[PDB]
Amino acid sequence: SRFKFIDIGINLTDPMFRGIYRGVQKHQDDLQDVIGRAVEIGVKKFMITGGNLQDSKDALHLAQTNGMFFSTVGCHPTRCGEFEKNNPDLYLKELLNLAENNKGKVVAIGECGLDFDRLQFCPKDTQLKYFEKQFELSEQTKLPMFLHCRNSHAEFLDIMKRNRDRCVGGVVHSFDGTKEAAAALIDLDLYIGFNGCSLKTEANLEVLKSIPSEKLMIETDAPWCGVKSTHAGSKYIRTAFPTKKKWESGHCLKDRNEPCHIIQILEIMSAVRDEDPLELANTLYNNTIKVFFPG
Ligand SMILES: Nc1ncnc2c1ncn2[C@H]1C[C@H](O)[C@@H](COP(=O)(O)O)O1
Ligand SMILES: Nc1ncnc2c1ncn2[C@H]1C[C@H](O)[C@@H](COP(=O)(O)O)O1
Ligand SMILES: Nc1ncnc2c1ncn2[C@H]1C[C@H](O)[C@@H](CO)O1
Ligand SMILES: Nc1ncnc2[nH]cnc12
Ligand code: NA
Ligand SMILES: [Zn+2]
Ligand SMILES: [Zn+2]
Numbered sequence: 001s002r003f004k005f006i007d008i009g010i011n012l013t014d015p016m017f018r019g020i021y022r023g024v025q026k027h028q029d030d031l032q033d034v035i036g037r038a039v040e041i042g043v044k045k046f047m048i049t050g051g052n053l054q055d056s057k058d059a060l061h062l063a064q065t066n067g068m069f070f071s072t073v074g075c076h077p078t079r080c081g082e083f084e085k086n087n088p089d090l091y092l093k094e095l096l097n098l099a100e101n102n103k104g105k106v107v108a109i110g111e112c113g114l115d116f117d118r119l120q121f122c123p124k125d126t127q128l129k130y131f132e133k134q135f136e137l138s139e140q141t142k143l144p145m146f147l148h149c150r151n152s153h154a155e156f157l158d159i160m161k162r163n164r165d166r167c168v169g170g171v172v173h174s175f176d177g178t179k180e181a182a183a184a185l186i187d188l189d190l191y192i193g194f195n196g197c198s199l200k201t202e203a204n205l206e207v208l209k210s211i212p213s214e215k216l217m218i219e220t221d222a223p224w225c226g227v228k229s230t231h232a233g234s235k236y237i238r239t240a241f242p243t244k245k246k247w248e249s250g251h252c253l254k255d256r257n258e259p260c261h262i263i264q265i266l267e268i269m270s271a272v273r274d275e276d277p278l279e280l281a282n283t284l285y286n287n288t289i290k291v292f293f294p295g
Helices: 031-041 053-063 088-100 124-133 135-141 153-166 179-186 202-209 259-273 277-292
Strands: 005-010 043-048 069-073 106-115 145-150 170-172 191-194 216-218
Touching (some): 005 216, 005 259, 005 277, 031 043, 043 053, 043 259, 053 069, 069 088, 088 106, 088 124, 088 135, 106 124, 106 153, 106 170, 124 135, 145 153, 153 179, 179 191, 179 202, 202 259, 216 259
Parallel strands (some): 005 043, 043 069, 145 170, 170 191, 191 216
16 A cells, blocks of 8 residues: 555465465465465565476466456576476477467566576576576566575676676575675666575675665565564564464464565564665555566
């Protein structure tokens, strides 16, 4: 109502929003209630993140259910082994066709990038090869990138510098790197995304203060990245939500982050930067429109 937000990365396809945890139905599907709470807090658009071919199809199909919903097409670093399970050239084409044939709903290439803290899911050589291959998607579709970078700044920056002309721009989401890393990404005319995972350490809060407002975007990565009392920014949260450990109607569930929690991320960022929250929220929204909704 007061604030307006675009969640640049919400996993609305995650089974937890249908009441399924570890393959077990624990409670009634409350996805519509989760969506409603976010709308009431000011979420105007939801970018449903795709993380592989099938999850990109699932994200688009859910996005087709609501005019506030949009999706991404790409392969997450942890899932890049899918390229070589079959034909990597065919897998790439299937992503391209899905993106190219659904302009309007599909607004970004991604999630893609590098995560050298999850090499148990996909080794470095495969991650490096298939992240760089997705620049074929960005160059052909003219869609901006939704990027992930964990424990991989040098390798990531090398790929981005060599391939920057093959994308129209993009955002490094869940940013958790140094001031120098942020500066190197800003020097490539990229944006920096902040969710709860961006705000866990004292150093994270200091790095945020070095980034201009017009270079930031906001997100939840729900159901992940919920802010805990052990995180450095938790003291700055101003809004709490009715929550239960065991599901009840009208309540969030403990440990399940939601899009409505994007207001907590805004409260932390505004407090850390000592910035008016409405001015910062409007700037974050406008940055997101400029990159992903330029129409
Ligand atoms: N296992 C593990 N180790 C280290 N860091 C991790 C791990 N899982 C998630 N993450 C971090 C990576 C991003 O900063 C954020 C969201 O990951 P996303 O993939 O966007 O949901 O969480
Ligand atoms: N191993 C590891 N390292 C870093 N970030 C991770 C890891 N596993 C998950 N994550 C990310 C995504 C989770 O939702 C959140 C848990 O951080 P918490 O502080 O437990 O609430 O942080
Ligand atoms: N390919 C994959 N197979 C299975 N699980 C996967 C994969 N990629 C990411 N994950 C998820 C589960 C981990 O707990 C989490 C990191 O904590 O990332
Ligand atoms: N435990 C987890 N499983 C899948 N994706 C994640 N992203 C962050 N944490 C995750
Ligand atoms: Na607080
Ligand atoms: Zn990510
Ligand atoms: Zn995520």
